[PDB]
């Protein structure tokens, strides 16, 4: 069972949030297809469910603003949330709910999608500037160097950073973004490496800000 989801992203107050989830594995028609959301740094709120008969149940917290829809042909189901405010900024997860066979007897949420962030703001999309954090000409007493990339002034979340197209993962720390007073995000991604690697190993940070279509590969050298 794999759940692939897309949509949400940046939208303005009073606009309509739209998400779609596609189910891989078969047995689409047997289940309540479910949406659950999580505001940043907060808990989980069940939004509602739809089955292949188009039968719904929405949380009264949101019910007046929600429409779910289902396309059994394409093993897809969707969410709309109307008249959004900052209260709707959240990670939205598509989830497999209870089977027809047994309902709440088998009602635990085993299968979750990776989630999609909705950001409710009037602010512009803005791609980051990517600046090298060059390894010092003086390494640690014990022969370790640190280097990184500063990913500065972007909106909205998220960004991804890899090193050497994912070949370098050990000692990587991609910091949680700081929301600056300006309302733009900034983060650093750093890695520690052997001093002895600096002469012969190329270090490149791969930055992707999908919201702005920004994709930057930045070589970091002494």
């Amino acid at each position: 069972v794999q759940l692939q989801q897309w949509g949400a992203g940046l939208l303005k107050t009073s606009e309509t949030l739209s998400l779609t989830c596609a189910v891989y594995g078969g047995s689409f028609n047997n289940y309540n297809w479910t949406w659950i959301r999580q505001p940043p740094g907060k808990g989980l709120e069940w939004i509602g469910q739809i089955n292949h008969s188009g039968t719904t149940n929405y949380n009264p917290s949101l019910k007046s603003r929600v429409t779910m829809s289902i396309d059994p042909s394409e093993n897809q189901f969707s969410l709309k949330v109307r008249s959004v405010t900052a209260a709707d900024t959240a990670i939205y997860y598509c989830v497999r709910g209870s089977p027809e066979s047994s309902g709440n007897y088998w009602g635990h949420f085993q299968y979750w999608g990776q989630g999609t962030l909705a950001t409710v703001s009037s602010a512009s999309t803005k791609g980051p500037s990517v600046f090298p954090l060059a390894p010092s000409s003086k390494s640690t007493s014990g022969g370790t160097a640190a280097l990184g990339c500063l990913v500065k002034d972007y909106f909205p979340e998220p960004v991804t950073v890899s090193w050497n197209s994912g070949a370098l993962t050990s000692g990587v720390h991609t910091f949680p973004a700081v929301l600056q007073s300006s309302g733009l995000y900034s983060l650093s991604s750093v890695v520690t490496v052997p001093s002895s690697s600096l002469g012969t190993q190329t270090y490149i940070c791969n930055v992707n800000h999908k919201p702005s279509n920004t994709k930057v590969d930045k070589k970091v050298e002494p």
Binding site: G43, L44, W46, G113, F131, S136, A146, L187, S188, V190
Partner: protein, 219 residues
């Protein structure tokens, strides 16, 4: 609605010891017909969806080791994590699936207590590229320390800085149970070029004395 309340909101438990997280439902979630509690426990790591651990209050999901134990009935439930492992760092949620709307506990954040580990400290001057743009970001990195509590003080030509820095701390590492921290000093190009010595001073329990990393602008 059935209100789900967890206790505590956060806890810090040593490697190899026992974590206990309580969950109360405002109404019984015992389906008397089946003698099953419609109560689930989830483990959520940063940037991941929740992972189901337990259904029916005490039945482990596939792939969950028996260190995770669910107990209780009716309104009062407990998740016990025995022989705590580094990879258990997460927020834990209870949830009722007794009746719609389905409702989650507020979450309990579990921190791993490990031995004290001193940070390695690095300072990065602003890039030439950034200076062209009229701003200078100076970065101080504290790498792989425990505990979380750390003091970073910026000094410019020996003057203590206030109001011009921002910190970010990583989530606790799922392998070595450490934190890392960035502190970023943000100046105008003009202010940056007015001063010579840029220093980061770190105070932490694992350090014999506060550690300073510094550079002279243009050296």
């Amino acid at each position: 609605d059935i209100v789900m309340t967890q206790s505590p909101d956060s806890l810090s438990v040593s490697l190899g010891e026992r974590a206990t997280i309580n969950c109360k439902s405002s109404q019984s979630v015992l389906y008397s017909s089946h003698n099953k509690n419609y109560l689930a426990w989830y483990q959520q790591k940063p940037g991941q969806p929740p992972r189901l651990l337990i259904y029916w209050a005490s039945t482990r999901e596939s792939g969950v080791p028996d260190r995770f134990s669910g107990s209780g009935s009716g309104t009062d439930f407990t998740l016990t994590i025995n022989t705590l492992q580094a990879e258990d760092v997460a927020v834990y949620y209870c949830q009722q699936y007794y009746t719609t709307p389905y409702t989650f506990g507020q979450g309990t954040k579990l921190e791993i207590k490990r031995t004290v580990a001193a940070p390695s400290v690095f300072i990065f001057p602003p890039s030439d590229e950034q200076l062209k743009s009229g701003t200078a970001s100076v970065v101080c990195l504290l790498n792989n320390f425990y505990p979380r509590e750390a003091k970073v003080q910026w000094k410019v030509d020996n003057a203590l800085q206030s109001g011009n820095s921002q910190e970010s701390v990583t989530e606790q590492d799922s392998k070595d149970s450490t934190y890392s921290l960035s502190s970023t000093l943000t100046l105008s190009k003009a202010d940056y070029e007015k001063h010579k010595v840029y220093a980061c001073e770190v105070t932490h329990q694992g350090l014999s004395s506060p550690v300073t990393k510094s550079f002279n602008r243009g050296e």
